[PDB]
Amino acid sequence: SINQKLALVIKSGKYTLGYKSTVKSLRQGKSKLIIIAANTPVLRKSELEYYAMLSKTKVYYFQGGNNELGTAVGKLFRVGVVSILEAGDSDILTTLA
Amino acid sequence: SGRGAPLAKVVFRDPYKYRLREEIFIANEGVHTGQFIYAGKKASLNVGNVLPLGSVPEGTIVSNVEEKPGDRGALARASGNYVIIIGHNPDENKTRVRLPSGAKKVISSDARGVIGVIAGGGRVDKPLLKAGRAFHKYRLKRNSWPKTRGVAM
Amino acid sequence: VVDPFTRKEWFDIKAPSTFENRNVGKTLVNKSTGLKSASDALKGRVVEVCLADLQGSEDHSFRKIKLRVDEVQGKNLLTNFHGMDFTTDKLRSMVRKWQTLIEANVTVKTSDDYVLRIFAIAFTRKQANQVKRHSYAQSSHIRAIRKVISEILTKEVQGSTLAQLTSKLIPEVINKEIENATKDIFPLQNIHVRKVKLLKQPKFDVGALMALHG
Amino acid sequence: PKKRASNGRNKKGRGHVKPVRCVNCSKSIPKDKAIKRMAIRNIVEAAAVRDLSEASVYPEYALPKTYNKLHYCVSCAIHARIVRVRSREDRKNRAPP
Amino acid sequence: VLVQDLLHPTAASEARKHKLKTLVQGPRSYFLDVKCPGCLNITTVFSHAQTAVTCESCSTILCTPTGGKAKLSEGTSFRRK
Amino acid sequence: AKRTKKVGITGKYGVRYGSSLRRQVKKLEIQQHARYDCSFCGKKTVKRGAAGIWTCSCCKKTVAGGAYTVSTAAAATVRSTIRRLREMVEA
Amino acid sequence: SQVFGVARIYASFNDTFVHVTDLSGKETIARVTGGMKVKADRDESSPYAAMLAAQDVAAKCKEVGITAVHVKIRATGGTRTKTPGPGGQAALRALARSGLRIGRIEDVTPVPSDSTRKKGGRRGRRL
Amino acid sequence: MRAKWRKKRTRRLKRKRRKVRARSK
RNA sequence: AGGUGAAAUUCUUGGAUUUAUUGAAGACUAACUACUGCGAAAGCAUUUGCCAAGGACGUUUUCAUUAAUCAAGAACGAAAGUUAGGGGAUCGAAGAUGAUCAGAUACCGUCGUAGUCUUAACCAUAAACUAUGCCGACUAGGGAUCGGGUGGUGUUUUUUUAAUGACCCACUCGGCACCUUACGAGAAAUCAAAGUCUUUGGGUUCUGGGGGGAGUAUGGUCGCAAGGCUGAAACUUAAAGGAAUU
C-alpha cells in the first residue's frame, strides 16, 4: 500500500514538498526519492526526470497529483513533488516505487 | 461571434518553406489551449487529430469532415452535433458514415476528418427566455428575426 | 407457363479435403437467362447438414457443418469450411436438470490472415459416490472454468487457419486438453466446442484454397 | 383463509422473482408460480414410428428428441393440464412419478 | 434430558460442539515448534496465522496462512505445541 | 442564506416569464456560473470565459468544453471511446 | 449416394408448409400450402390436410428427381405457442408413406427468447 | 362494488369538488 | 397467408405467406434455475474489466457497555403516473374498428400514439404479504439444503504414494424453508411460534375499539399534477364481520 508507506515517511523521515525546496534539496544531493504527478506540467517533469539521473534517485510516476498525492501526504494544500531526503522507518527505497 | 461552439486557431508551419501560417480547424469538446493536433494518416487515433477516414474504424466519431474527400471541411460543423462511422470497405476507398437527422453518406477513405465533437453540450437544450438574448442572437447572424406571421398581414 | 425446373440446372457439392465423402451432394443451379449468368448467380449460399453424413462417422449422430459456396469449376462447386453448427436436439439433450450449464464464446485470428469466433460448452457432473440430488459449481470455480476455456481455444488456433483447426475440430481433440484443466478443479461432463461462425476472410483467394482442392 | 404453506405457490427466502409468460394464454405469472413439465417426446406419432425407420435410410440412425418446457398460467392449466383440484389432505402431497 | 450432570461430562460432546455453547469457552487451537530446514532453530507458530509467518535467521517461509490453520509449506516438520 | 427558497439564482425573473422555463434555467444557469475545476493544474480556477471556453486563472489555461458544463454526456462517452479504441491502437 | 436435401415442414397452429429444397435452400423445390388442398379456414392445421398437402409435394419431388430428404420441422414459436401444431403429425406420415428416403431429420424452430413481449397482455388472452 | 373502482369514483368527485370550490376561489 | 369456438377485417396472383445469404436498431438474458443464493425494503435472473460495499465462518487480535428500540426527522422505495431529451423492436392504456351479443361502448380478432427502457430529476404509493415489529435467552427431534471451519493411514486426482483440488461420513455455528407430532397456544384454520398469558409483568416502536358516512368534509402541509402525509362531523343502523359445520 503506497498509501500508508509515505504516511510513515512523513511521520518520521525528511521530506520536502515544492519545486524550489525539492530542486534545492537535489542541488545539495541528499534526496533519494522524487515522486512526480502524471498530470502536472511535463515541462516541470521533463527537468525533474533529467535531475533524477543527475542526482541518482528512483523516480516514480505517482497515480495522482496536487489533490491526489497531497491528499495522502496529509495536507489540505496542493503538491505534486515529494522529494524525500532520507526515509524514517519505511523502506520506500526497495519497493514498487 | 455568430456560432455556439469555439474555433481551433491551429497554427501550422509548411515543410516546403521556412514559415508558419495559422490554419483554422474547429474546437472539440475535450481539448486544451496548447494541446497537440496531428494531421497525416500516419498519426495515432486521438481527439483534435485529423487524418483521412482510412485511418479510423466503425464506432469512431469525428467532426468537420467532407462529402468531397478533401474539400477542407464540410459536414460535421455544429454545437452538440457529432458524426459516427459504421461500415468501412477498403480497396477503391468507400467508408459508410452516420450524419445528424439519421442520414448515411458513403465516401472515399482519403476523406479528411478531425476526431472529436464540436464544443456546445446541450446548448439549445436551454431556453433563450428574454427576447433580448433573442435579438443579440441574430445580432450576429441576419435580420431573419423576428418573424411576422403571414395569416395576420 | 414454362415450369422453371426445365431451366434450373443440377449441381454437385465437393468439400475441402479434410471431409469423408468430398461429394457432399447434388442440388440445383440456374440456367443462364435474361440479365443473369450461372457460376456468378449463386455462391452466396451455405451447406448446412448432418456432420456425421459429411464425415461418414455414425458416432457423430448430432453436430452439423456449415459451408459457404466459394468458386465453382466444371459445374462442380468446391465449397469452403464456412463453420460448424449443433443440432438443437443434442443441445437440450446435454442440458440435464439438478446441474449447471456453462456456454462460452471467444474470438481468435489466424497467423495466415483470417478471423472467426469459436465456442465451447460445459456442464457440471457428479462424483464416484455422489449423494446430493444436485451438484453445482462454486461460481468462482465456474470463473476458473471459462477462464482457461477461451484460453486454450486461442492457444492452438495459430496455424494453417481453420483448415488445421477442423483437423482437431470434429475429431474432438479440444475436449482432451480442455478436460485437462477442468480435472484439477471440477470434473464436468461433455465439454465440446458447440458451434462457431466466420466473419472475415483474406479475399476470394482460391489460390490458398488449392491445398484442400486438388 | 390461507390454504397453502408457500402462500399460493413457492415464495420464501427472497422478496420478488421474475414472471415468465404462460405457454398458453400468455398470462404473465411468476417463475415460482409456474407449473412446468419437460415434454422431451419424439417427432414420431403413435403409429408411423416403425413405418419411419422402415421407409428410412441409415442403420436405424438414432432418431431425434425435442426437449421442450411447458409453463402454465394456473387458470388454463386447470381447464386441461395435470391438476384436477387435488384432495384436501394430499394438497401438501408432492410426487415425481 | 430428565437428569444429567454438567460437571464431569463426556470429553466427547465437550470438545466437539461450539466452544461458546459447551461451557468455559476453550480455544480449540495450538502452536507448532516447526523446524526451519536450512539452519538449526524452530519457530512457535500459531495455528490460525493469517499473516505470512517466516524464518528469523535465514528468512524463507514457515507455513502459508490459509482459511483456518496455516498448513505447512510442503517440506516443514510440524510439532504440536 | 435563505433570501429565496426554491427560486435560487433565478428569483430575478419574478412575475415576468413562466415558472417551468426558469426552473430549467436554474439547473444549467447554476452550472456555467459555478467556479469549475481546471483538471490540468488541479485547482478549480477554470470557469465559463465564453461558450465552449473555460479559462484557468492559473497558467492561464483556456479550455474547450460544453455550452454550460466543462463536459456534458456528449464528450464524456466519446472521450472514453477514444481511450477504448486507443487500446487496439498500440496494444 | 443419392440427391438428398431438406423438406422444411412448418407445424404452425392453423397452417403447415412442406417446401422441399436443397442443403442451402436458396433454391427451393415445391411448397404446397395447407389450405391449398382444402378451403374451410377451420381446417388449416387439420391432419387430413397435412397428408393431402404432403401427398402432393411427394408427387412434385419424383418430377424433378429428388430421392433423399431431411425434414426440418418448425413451430410458430418466437413469441407464439412454440407447441408443434397437429399438421406436423400426418405430414411426416404423409411423405413417409409416399415413398421417399427419409434421411437425417432434425429440427430448428424459432428460439423463444421470452425477451420480446408475447402479444396478449399481463392479464393474458382471457378467451 | 370493489373499492379499486370506488377509490376512482371519489377520485373523480375529488378533482370535481376541488375545481368547483376553486371556481369561487 | 394471418386469425378464431367458428368468422370477418388484414396482407391477395405490381409474387404475398413461406426459404435462405447478409446488415442495422432497440429489447432481453430463455433452457441451466429449484419449497436455492444475495440484498435494508423494493428487489436482483448472461459475460468480462475496474471501483469500492456487504456478510457468514473462523482467529490464544483491539477497544471496552460503547447497547436496545425508536416520536419528529432523513437515504432507497417495484409499477403506474411525470418534466424533459437520446428512441417506441415487441407489446400496447386510449382509440379505431371485425364479429360475437337481444346490445357489447367489453371479453376474442387487426393496427396502433402514452408508456416501455436509457440520461438527469420527480411524486413515496402496491394483497409494498412473512396480511405475523425489532432486540433477548430458554421449551424439539428429524431430514434436507446454503456458507465457511475442524477431524479422516478415507474416494479420485496416477505424472512416482509426488504437493493438493473436487467427493464421501460425524459434528458444528450463521443461512433457507419444510416434515413430525404440539407438550402449549389458539375462535378454528393453523402456529417450534402466535410457547414461556388469570399460574396474566425480560425492553420497547406503532396501531385498532359495532358498521356505515369514510383516508371522506375542512385546515394544514408535501407534490409540476394526479394526488400524497394529516384527518372529522351530522345522520343512520342491530347487525357487519372471522373461522369451521351442515
Side-chain angles (χ1 to χ4, degrees):
Chain A
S1 190
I2 192 68
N3 308 57
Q4 288 87 294
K5 281 197 186 307
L6 269 189
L8 181 168
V9 182
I10 288 176
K11 183 178 174 183
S12 300
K14 341 213 68 176
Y15 67 101
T16 186
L17 304 168
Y19 176 80
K20 268 96 80 164
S21 54
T22 63
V23 186
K24 192 137 61 69
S25 64
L26 243 60
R27 273 164 52 241
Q28 293 180 60
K30 296 182 171 301
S31 179
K32 303 84 172 295
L33 181 284
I34 54 141
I35 286 193
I36 304 173
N39 77 306
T40 62
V42 178
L43 159 78
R44 165 180 293 301
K45 301 172 64 173
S46 186
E47 76 184 90
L48 306 193
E49 308 169 14
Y50 187 42
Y51 291 128
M53 56 80 84
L54 285 164
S55 53
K56 296 165 61 184
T57 291
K58 258 60 68 185
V59 197
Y60 173 51
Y61 276 53
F62 205 60
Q63 176 187 293
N66 50 65
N67 227 311
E68 314 205 19
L69 170 61
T71 302
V73 302
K75 288 176 168 297
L76 278 43
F77 78 78
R78 34 194 63 82
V79 57
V81 56
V82 189
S83 194
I84 255 301
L85 288 71
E86 231 278 295
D89 302 354
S90 188
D91 67 357
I92 28 64
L93 291 295
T94 43
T95 55
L96 33 68
Chain B
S1 295
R3 199 202 310 306
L7 312 175
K9 284 286 207 58
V10 180
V11 65
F12 264 47
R13 321 77 88 83
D14 212 14
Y16 308 95
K17 156 194 176 180
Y18 166 59
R19 168 164 166 170
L20 300 67
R21 291 174 199 54
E22 176 189 61
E23 190 70 59
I24 293 179
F25 297 50
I26 302 187
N28 326 72
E29 201 180 12
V31 303
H32 67 266
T33 47
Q35 201 249 301
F36 270 52
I37 291 79
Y38 292 96
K41 318 194 67 174
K42 222 67 192 64
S44 175
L45 191 159
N46 306 80
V47 171
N49 294 61
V50 55
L51 288 43
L53 209 73
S55 299
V56 326
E58 68 283 62
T60 304
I61 293 185
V62 303
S63 73
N64 194 23
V65 63
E66 312 78 24
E67 343 90 303
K68 302 179 182 178
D71 78 350
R72 292 179 57 188
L75 297 167
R77 277 178 166 171
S79 309
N81 279 304
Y82 46 78
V83 285
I84 333 77
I85 275 70
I86 310 184
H88 208 309
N89 178 63
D91 281 354
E92 298 288 359
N93 307 298
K94 46 189 196 70
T95 298
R96 316 179 52 192
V97 309
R98 200 186 309 161
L99 271 155
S101 69
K104 293 189 61 176
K105 202 177 187 298
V106 66
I107 53 170
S108 182
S109 296
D110 282 353
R112 244 181 293 98
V114 47
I115 337 301
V117 304
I118 292 187
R123 179 164 79 84
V124 323
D125 294 301
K126 182 195 86 177
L128 197 51
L129 254 206
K130 63 186 292 67
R133 300 158 193 178
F135 168 82
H136 307 289
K137 183 181 179 184
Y138 301 83
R139 147 233 161 186
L140 303 158
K141 272 66 182 296
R142 56 204 73 69
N143 197 60
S144 50
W145 195 88
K147 271 176 172 57
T148 304
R149 309 182 284 87
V151 160
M153 57 223 241
Chain C
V1 271
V2 285
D3 194 285
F5 295 138
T6 322
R7 207 170 306 179
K8 315 303 171 293
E9 221 170 63
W10 282 47
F11 228 175
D12 33 302
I13 297 66
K14 274 284 289 62
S17 177
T18 56
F19 272 49
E20 198 70 303
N21 63 305
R22 294 173 66 179
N23 289 296
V24 188
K26 313 298 177 182
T27 61
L28 275 59
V29 203
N30 212 302
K31 184 191 186 80
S32 298
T33 36
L35 303 186
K36 198 70 50 50
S37 52
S39 294
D40 36 300
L42 36 294
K43 306 183 307 301
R45 305 176 170 184
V46 282
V47 187
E48 285 186 59
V49 62
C50 193
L51 141 290
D53 188 5
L54 52 78
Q55 198 52 290
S57 296
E58 262 64 2
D59 49 301
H60 289 54
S61 59
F62 41 104
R63 301 183 67 179
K64 293 167 59 58
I65 300 294
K66 145 174 167 281
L67 299 311
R68 177 172 50 185
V69 191
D70 258 54
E71 284 289 61
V72 51
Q73 55 192 63
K75 204 264 293 184
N76 183 49
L77 64 85
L78 270 302
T79 193
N80 165 61
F81 173 77
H82 196 192
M84 203 148 97
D85 189 66
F86 205 169
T87 60
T88 73
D89 300 296
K90 178 61 178 180
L91 278 72
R92 268 56 170 61
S93 192
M94 280 166 55
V95 179
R96 186 48 60 188
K97 198 181 187 179
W98 305 145
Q99 63 178 54
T100 299
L101 169 156
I102 304 77
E103 281 195 303
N105 69 72
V106 74
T107 68
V108 61
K109 176 178 172 63
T110 60
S111 66
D112 195 51
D113 316 298
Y114 215 120
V115 188
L116 45 95
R117 188 172 301 169
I118 37 182
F119 281 82
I121 199 168
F123 284 97
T124 64
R125 64 171 177 179
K126 303 182 181 184
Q127 186 80 191
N129 35 51
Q130 182 76 180
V131 185
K132 42 187 178 179
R133 188 195 184 187
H134 302 68
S135 186
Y136 303 118
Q138 271 289 302
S139 189
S140 70
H141 284 184
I142 277 183
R143 294 164 187 167
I145 287 183
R146 304 186 292 194
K147 177 206 171 187
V148 183
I149 283 186
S150 293
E151 172 82 51
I152 300 179
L153 304 185
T154 55
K155 288 195 303 67
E156 278 286 55
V157 167
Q158 46 175 171
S160 298
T161 320
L162 44 278
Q164 181 191 304
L165 223 301
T166 305
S167 289
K168 296 196 175 187
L169 262 160
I170 300 172
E172 293 192 297
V173 180
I174 308 295
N175 296 45
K176 295 293 75 178
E177 198 166 0
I178 296 292
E179 185 73 297
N180 280 309
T182 305
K183 72 199 296 177
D184 290 303
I185 297 298
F186 195 126
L188 273 72
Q189 57 186 69
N190 298 100
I191 315 172
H192 310 300
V193 263
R194 202 184 79 75
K195 302 180 183 186
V196 49
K197 102 143 292 187
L198 279 39
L199 46 288
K200 282 175 59 187
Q201 49 175 48
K203 226 76 77 65
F204 210 16
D205 283 1
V206 290
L209 174 58
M210 295 298 265
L212 298 151
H213 306 173
Chain D
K2 301 178 178 296
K3 51 177 173 180
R4 324 188 204 300
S6 60
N7 281 61
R9 307 213 74 180
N10 167 45
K11 199 303 178 179
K12 292 168 177 289
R14 313 159 306 295
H16 173 205
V17 286
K18 194 86 295 182
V20 293
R21 301 305 289 296
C22 170
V23 82
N24 198 66
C25 64
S26 299
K27 171 184 175 62
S28 184
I29 195 166
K31 184 170 177 54
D32 68 287
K33 187 132 159 289
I35 160 185
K36 333 81 171 182
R37 284 154 183 52
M38 271 207 286
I40 72 296
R41 308 179 307 163
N42 306 296
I43 336 71
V44 295
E45 56 185 3
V49 59
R50 191 165 195 289
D51 294 65
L52 179 285
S53 61
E54 204 67 50
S56 278
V57 295
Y58 313 141
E60 180 59 294
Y61 169 49
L63 203 290
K65 297 182 64 177
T66 58
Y67 290 27
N68 186 56
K69 182 156 291 297
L70 274 290
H71 290 295
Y72 287 88
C73 57
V74 171
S75 284
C76 293
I78 291 174
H79 197 57
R81 186 76 304 92
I82 316 298
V83 49
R84 292 64 178 70
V85 66
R86 304 189 56 183
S87 69
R88 179 61 182 183
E89 329 82 288
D90 288 72
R91 284 198 182 207
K92 322 176 185 182
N93 192 55
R94 302 164 66 113
Chain E
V1 61
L2 215 294
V3 40
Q4 173 85 320
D5 189 11
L6 291 151
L7 289 178
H8 274 53
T10 59
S13 62
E14 199 64 44
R16 60 164 52 185
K17 303 198 72 56
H18 218 304
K19 69 303 178 303
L20 299 171
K21 181 183 172 183
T22 56
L23 213 71
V24 169
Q25 55 170 298
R28 298 286 184 57
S29 66
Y30 74 122
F31 291 55
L32 301 67
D33 284 66
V34 185
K35 297 184 174 183
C36 54
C39 177
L40 290 165
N41 277 65
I42 50 178
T43 53
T44 303
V45 191
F46 172 39
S47 56
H48 307 62
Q50 279 136 54
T51 38
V53 282
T54 56
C55 184
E56 194 72 295
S57 52
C58 60
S59 300
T60 167
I61 179 61
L62 307 175
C63 53
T64 54
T66 49
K69 289 185 178 179
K71 281 104 81 177
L72 315 183
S73 189
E74 187 184 357
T76 36
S77 45
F78 62 155
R79 188 177 296 289
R80 241 94 306 186
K81 285 184 171 181
Chain F
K2 193 195 80 174
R3 312 91 94 177
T4 45
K5 193 176 181 183
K6 74 189 74 177
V7 295
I9 180 182
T10 169
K12 41 182 175 176
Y13 302 130
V15 301
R16 60 183 196 198
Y17 307 78
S19 62
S20 292
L21 314 180
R22 314 169 308 165
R23 183 198 296 290
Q24 221 309 288
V25 196
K26 169 178 186 173
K27 179 183 171 53
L28 276 174
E29 172 141 351
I30 258 176
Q31 280 178 59
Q32 32 177 42
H33 283 202
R35 194 215 234 180
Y36 268 129
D37 200 345
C38 164
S39 298
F40 208 33
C41 291
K43 324 177 198 301
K44 53 190 299 178
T45 67
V46 85
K47 199 173 172 299
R48 200 224 173 187
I53 297 181
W54 314 88
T55 64
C56 176
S57 304
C58 196
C59 199
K60 309 201 69 179
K61 300 304 284 281
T62 300
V63 171
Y68 302 112
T69 165
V70 169
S71 184
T72 178
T77 171
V78 178
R79 187 175 297 164
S80 61
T81 297
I82 301 309
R83 268 288 299 183
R84 190 141 59 77
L85 305 196
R86 214 190 67 179
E87 299 298 7
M88 300 81 90
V89 164
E90 53 177 357
Chain G
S1 297
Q2 304 282 297
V3 47
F4 307 68
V6 286
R8 263 139 193 167
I9 277 188
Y10 181 50
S12 68
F13 207 119
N14 305 305
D15 184 60
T16 25
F17 292 138
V18 194
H19 92 309
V20 49
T21 78
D22 77 79
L23 49 88
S24 173
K26 187 276 189 180
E27 198 49 53
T28 169
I29 302 80
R31 194 195 65 187
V32 291
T33 71
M36 266 179 73
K37 328 305 296 75
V38 50
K39 291 184 176 181
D41 289 312
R42 166 190 64 277
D43 291 303
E44 286 191 307
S45 53
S46 52
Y48 198 51
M51 266 274 250
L52 274 56
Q55 214 70 301
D56 191 10
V57 65
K60 225 74 179 71
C61 173
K62 275 302 182 293
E63 287 301 344
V64 192
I66 293 61
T67 45
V69 65
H70 305 172
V71 301
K72 279 185 187 179
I73 289 186
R74 182 191 189 298
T76 319
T79 44
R80 305 294 186 72
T81 181
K82 176 70 271 296
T83 306
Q89 298 298 304
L92 183 292
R93 173 52 185 168
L95 55 119
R97 174 194 170 71
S98 78
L100 287 184
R101 310 289 292 183
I102 311 301
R104 255 123 182 176
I105 79 173
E106 54 260 298
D107 202 60
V108 279
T109 63
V111 186
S113 179
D114 183 7
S115 164
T116 298
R117 206 67 167 185
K118 191 169 188 292
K119 51 183 294 181
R122 183 185 181 69
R123 205 92 57 58
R125 180 175 172 294
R126 298 180 248 67
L127 38 294
Chain H
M1 220 283 236
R2 60 273 287 84
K4 192 164 53 186
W5 300 164
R6 195 176 190 68
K7 263 279 190 175
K8 214 72 182 301
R9 165 188 297 305
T10 69
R11 234 53 165 302
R12 284 202 289 180
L13 312 189
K14 196 172 186 181
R15 314 182 190 82
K16 190 177 185 66
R17 284 200 309 287
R18 94 186 306 286
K19 297 299 187 63
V20 165
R21 206 200 75 69
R23 210 181 209 294
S24 311
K25 190 172 293 298

